[PDB]
C-alpha cells in the first residue's frame with residue numbers, strides 16, 4: 001500500500017470513469033501522490049464529500065456529516081458547530097484523504113473558514129456560472145472584468161478552473177468579519193457587476209435568470225457551504241481537475257476542464273515550481289469602508 005498512503009483499497013479495479021478506463025485504485029493513488037497539494041486547502045478546513053459508490057455513471061452522495069466514519073484518520077468535529085446533525089468532517093492527512101476515496105469519495109469541497117475560527121471566514125468565493133451554451137470567450141472576458149473590479153477595490157484574487165464549465169475566484173480575508181458580512185459583501189460585488197453590465201452579468205441564481213449571461217454566484221459564502229478544492233477531481237467525464245492558474249494565462253485557456261487527473265502531472269512539470277497561488281498564504285486584506293463605498 002506504499003502508493004496508497006498505507007490504505008487498503010477494496011475492489012481496486014472497479015471503474016470510476018469508464019470513458020477513460022480510470023479505476024478506483026488509480027483514483028486512490030492520485031490522492032496519495034498529490035495529498036500534499038490537496039491538503040494546501042483541506043488541512044485546516046471542514047470538508048464536504050461527493051461520493052460515487054458506482055462511479056460517475058451512477059449517482060452522487062453529497063455528505064457533510066457522519067456518525068460512524070470508517071476512514072482511519074478522518075477527524076470528526078464538534079456537533080455544537082451544527083446542532084441537530086452528526087459531526088462535521090475534516091481531513092488533515094494523506095491517510096485520511098485516501099481513506100475517504102476508499103469509501104467512495106471522488107470530490108472534496110471545503111468551507112470558507114478554518115479551524116482557527118469557524119465563525120469568521122478567511123475567504124470568500126465568486127463562482128462564475130455561464131449559460132450552458134455561452135461561448136468560452138465570454139467566460140474569459142467575464143473573468144477579466146471581474147478581476148478588474150477586484151483590483152479597483154484593492155483585493156488580491158486567486159483563480160482556478162472549476163473542472164466543470166466555469167472559473168472560481170478566491171479572495172482571502174483576515175478573520176475580522178462574521179459570516180453574514182462576508183456573504184453580503186460578495187453579493188454586493190455580484191450585484192455591482194450586474195448593474196454595470198446587465199448584458200453580461202446576473203446577480204440572481206437560477207438558469208432562467210442567466211440566459212445568455214453569466215451568474216456571479218456568491219451563495220457559496222453561506223456558513224456550511226463549500227467549494228471544490230484546488231487540485232481536486234470532479235465526478236464528470238474525463239475526470240477533470242480544478243486547477244489554479246495565473247491571470248496571465250487566462251486568455252490562453254480553452255475550457256474549465258482542460259486538465260484532468262492524468263494530465264495534471266504534465267501541468268505541474270510545465271510549471272516546474274511556478275505556483276499561481278504563491279502569494280495566497282501571505283495575503284492580508286479586509287473589507288474596508290472604501291470598498292463598500294465603491295460598491
Ligand SMILES: Nc1ncnc2c1ncn2[C@@H]1O[C@H](COP(=O)(O)OP(=O)(O)OP(=O)(O)O)[C@@H](O)[C@H]1O
Pocket residue numbers: 048061062109127129162163164165166167220225226227228256
Ligand atoms: N447534491 C448536492 N446537494 C447540495 N449541494 C451540493 C450538491 N452537490 C454539490 N453541491 C454544492 O454546490 C456547489 C456546486 O457544485 P458545482 O460542480 O455544480 O459548481 P462548480 O464547482 O462551479 O462546477 P461548474 O463550473 O460545473 O458550475 C458545490 O461547491 C457543492 O459544495
Ligand SMILES: [Mn+2]
Pocket residue numbers: 127128129162166
Ligand atoms: Mn459553477
Ligand SMILES: [Mn+2]
Pocket residue numbers: 127129217
Ligand atoms: Mn454556483
